[PDB]
Ligand binder design. Structure first.
Ligand SMILES: *[C@@H]1O[C@H](CO)[C@@H](O)[C@H](O)[C@H]1NC(C)=O
Ligand SMILES: *[C@@H]1O[C@H](CO)[C@@H](O)[C@H](O)[C@H]1NC(C)=O
Ligand SMILES: [Cl-]
Length: 113
């Protein structure tokens, strides 16, 4: 089974395997597709972060690098950074995935508008 953000922010969810190992770029893309989603772009993750989305996991985006959205600094998440922090790693490296749902119309899929 996959782990997924319960509430998507600006259409974005963190998607991971339930246990290690995580996913190379191809595998992350395929996880999003299996859910009927696409791999999110860096811009989509940034829009989510600007509406309150943060995680402590690096995940693939469509630009073929990994990102982490951070609002609060934490030494163990994005090396204490804030914003959407980038890790340029080979496509073979394992990360989670950021997926985007183009059908979402709410800022937070758990907060009705
Ligand atoms: C990614 O993982 C798949 C296994 O699901 C493998 O077939 C593929 O070669 C891997 N790609 C890279 C670049 O390591
Ligand atoms: C995608 O968003 C639509 C509309 O909010 C929702 O009905 C659907 O369940 C979502 N699917 C996933 C996999 O997030
Ligand atoms: Cl959407």
């Amino acid at each position: 089974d996959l782990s997924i953000s319960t509430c998507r922010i600006m259409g974005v969810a963190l998607v991971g395997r339930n246990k290690n190992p995580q996913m190379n770029f191809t595998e992350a893309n395929e996880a999003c597709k299996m859910l009927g989603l696409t791999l999110a772009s860096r811009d989509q993750v940034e829009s989510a972060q600007k509406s309150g989305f943060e995680t402590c996991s690096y995940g693939w985006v469509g630009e073929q690098f990994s990102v982490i959205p951070r609002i609060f600094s934490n030494p163990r998440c994005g090396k204490n950074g804030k914003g959407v922090l980038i890790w340029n790693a080979p496509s073979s490296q394992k990360f989670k995935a950021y997926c985007h749902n183009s059908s979402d119309t709410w800022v937070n899929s758990c907060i009705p508008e």
